[PDB]
Amino acid sequence: QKNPEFGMNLANQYIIRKGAGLPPAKDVKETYPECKWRHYAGSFGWLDDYNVQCYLSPSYKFHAHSIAKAFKAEPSTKAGACFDTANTDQFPEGVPKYSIGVPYLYMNNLYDRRCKVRAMVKIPKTDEHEEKWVQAWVIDHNLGNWDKDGKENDAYPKDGVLIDTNMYEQFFDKNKKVPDYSKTVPVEWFFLDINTVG
Amino acid sequence: QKNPEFGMNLANQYIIRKGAGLPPAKDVKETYPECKWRHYAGSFGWLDDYNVQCYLSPSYKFHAHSIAKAFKAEPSTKAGACFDTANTDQFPEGVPKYSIGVPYLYMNNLYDRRCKVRAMVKIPKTDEHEEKWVQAWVIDHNLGNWDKDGKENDAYPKDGVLIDTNMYEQFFDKNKKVPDYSKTVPVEWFFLDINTVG
């Protein structure tokens, strides 16, 4: 099976060629200004200016900048929102090397769930490693309704993401690890195979 | 199961209230000008200005304007690209009342196949009926590499769609049916639950 079916291998452009030869990346918030966290009919949700549900499609041209919490990947391969979705092309057996979970800002849970799809995630330079992009898999959905410090509230926007605990510790210098995962970390990422906004 | 999970019932706004109150539609081509039919590594494909595969996400704000041919819906409930995709919420048993098939301009066949998703399709005024919007289901993929008159070529853009034979005959006046299905028809449509571009 040829993968990608058409065009350049984008993942290798980031992983082997460090993102060279690509346009300056904009922020995915710019693709849909009216996609806001709104109240309607007794719920909060991601709604546009006509109260139609919306969600964002971050791509290599429009990266997401999210506040992440850690999660333990292995349980989401046995339970959760994605584990019984049909396997997609090259989806790993076992636990993916890099795993994320995404909230309603980035999916529709009835018709566009984005379970078992690929995402590129940037791990910034630390004193242990150069900055690097990695190819991760979506293996669960999450709420993500926390503020910058991780405080959760039912009225807060559902926009935070989850990154697996091993990845998470790679965001910190040798002597700044967070063994109880109590700190949020900012994460820049996008969907590797979704490219629908110019 | 609440459906849509958030926000207003968009299908009813078109089916019952004819689209009233909604913004005048634009054309989905404006959402991705650099998504073009290009040649790369021995194949034609929908590719952007960096040779990355792309596809369009027409919504109620950004309608697709396509050239359609007729197809027989029932065989695509038993074989084809979609019939064995997991059923989605409210997907009909048996043959949907209105069915379409879509090409690579509008999907990614590995990770965003848009099988068994909902689309709104406009059926134009004829001498038999008023203009009306109907809620259809995607039940197959198609090639769609024909020009505006239906002539097919391996190098032509894969952008035409399929509409079922019963919808097709509704595009024609009482005494102007096309029983050999040789005539294409222009169709305006969008994805009912995909709303990712402002």
> Residue A107 CA to chain centroid, in angstroms?
11
Q: Establish whether the linkage from the previous residue to B4 is cis, with ω within 30° of 0.
A: yes
Cα distances (Å, whole numbers) of residue B151 to A23, A83, B43: 37, 44, 20
* B117: chain A residues, CB-CB within 8 Å: 111-112
| DSSP class per residue in chain B | --SSSSB--HHHHHHTTTTTTSPPPEEGGGG-TT-EEEEETTEEEEE-TTSBB------SSEEEEEEEEEE-TGGGGTSSSSTTSPPPTTPPSSS-SSEEEE-GGG-BTTTB--TT-EEEEEE---SSS--EEEEEEEEEE----B-TTS-B-TTS-S--EEEEHHHHHTTS-TT---TT----EEEEEEETT-----
Contact status of B81 with chain A (Cβ, < 8 Å): no
State the DSSP code for A91: P
Instruction: Give all domains of chain B, ordered by start, each with its CATH number.
Output: 10-191 (2.40.40.10)
φ, ψ dihedrals at B152, nearest 5°: -100, 145
Phi-psi region of B80 (alpha: psi -120 to 50; beta: other; left: phi over 0): left
The dihedrals phi and psi of B122, each to the nearest 5 degrees, come to -90, 130
Contact B191, B117 (CB under 8 A): yes
Indicate the SS3 state at residue A178: coil
Rounded to whole angstroms, the Cα distance separating A95 from A77 reads: 7
**For A30-89, what is the HEC assignment?**
HHCCCCEEEEECCEEEEECCCCEECCCCCECCEEEEEEEEEECHHHHCCCCCCCCCCCCC
Write the single-letter amino acid at B22: L
Quick one: which H or E segment has residue A170? Answer: helix A165-170
Q: If you measure CA to CA, which chain B residue comes closest to A4?
A: B53
Pick B88's closest partner by Cβ from A47, A110, A196: A110
CA dist B101 and B45 (Å) reads 18
The sign of the torsion formed by the CA atoms of A180, A182, A184, A185 equals negative
CA–CA dist A74, B46 (Å, integer):
36
Chosen for mutation from A22, A47, A110 (greatest number of chain B CBs closer than 10 Å) is A110
- How far apart CA A123 and CA A167 sit, in angstroms, is 8
B:115-134 residues touching chain A, CB 8 A cutoff: 117-118
Under 8 Å between Cβ of B198 and A36: no
Contact A99, A107 (CB under 8 A): no
List beta partners, residue A68.
Answer: A161, A185
- A52's CB contacts (< 8 A; 6+ apart) are B4, B7, B8, B10, B60, B195
| Residue at token pair 């690890």 | A177
Query: What is the bridge-based pairing of β-strands A185-191 and A62-71?
Result: antiparallel
How many CB atoms are located within 10 Å of the residue A152 CB?
Answer: 12
Interface check for A12 against chain B (CB to CB < 8 A): the answer is no
